[PDB]
């Protein structure tokens, strides 16, 4: 079952990665090596609180952080982390 949404409580911290290396980049490259569709991100907002989330779809499965972020870009990195971590894949961490 590739249904519903898989979630983890994660946040993107650039200090966890080498310079110019991000979870989004790592997820894109994993999809390219496995010849899967490229990841698709969809933005979720709570505009009242100035908050963002993102749901990423990879191999027909949706992934999303349980946490909310201050920007769309930061939320997308969090979604990519959930996708990588929940599958036990490397995310480019130091």
Residue numbers in the entry: 348 to 441
Quote the study's own text.
Overall, the dsRBD structure contains an N-terminal extension (from Ser350 to residue 368) and the canonical αβββα topology (from Thr369 to Gly435). The N-terminal extension wraps the entire dsRBD, thus leading to a globular shape of the domain. This extension is made of a short β strand (β1) that interacts with the βββ fold, thereby forming an extended β-sheet followed by a long unstructured linker and a short α−helical turn (η1). The helices of the αβββα canonical fold pack against three antiparallel β strands as generally observed in classical dsRBDs such as in Xrpa. However, some variations are observed, notably a shorter β3 sheet and β1−β2 loop. Lys371, Lys419 and Lys420, located in conserved motifs as well as Arg397 are conserved basic residues among the dsRBDs and they are known to participate in the interaction with the dsRNA. To illustrate how the dsRBD of HsDus2 might bind its tRNA substrate which contains some dsRNA regions, a structural alignment of HsDus2dsRBD with the dsRBD of Xenopus leavis RNA binding protein A in complex with dsRNA was achieved. In the resulting model the dsRNA interacts with the protein via a ∼14 nucleotides-fragment, which can also be seen as the double-stranded region of the tRNA substrate corresponding to the acceptor and T-psi arm. The model also shows that the N-terminal extension does not interact with RNA suggesting its availability for protein-protein interaction. Remarkably, HsDus2dsRBD was also able to bind tRNA with an affinity in the same range of that of wild-type HsDus2 being ∼5–6 μM.
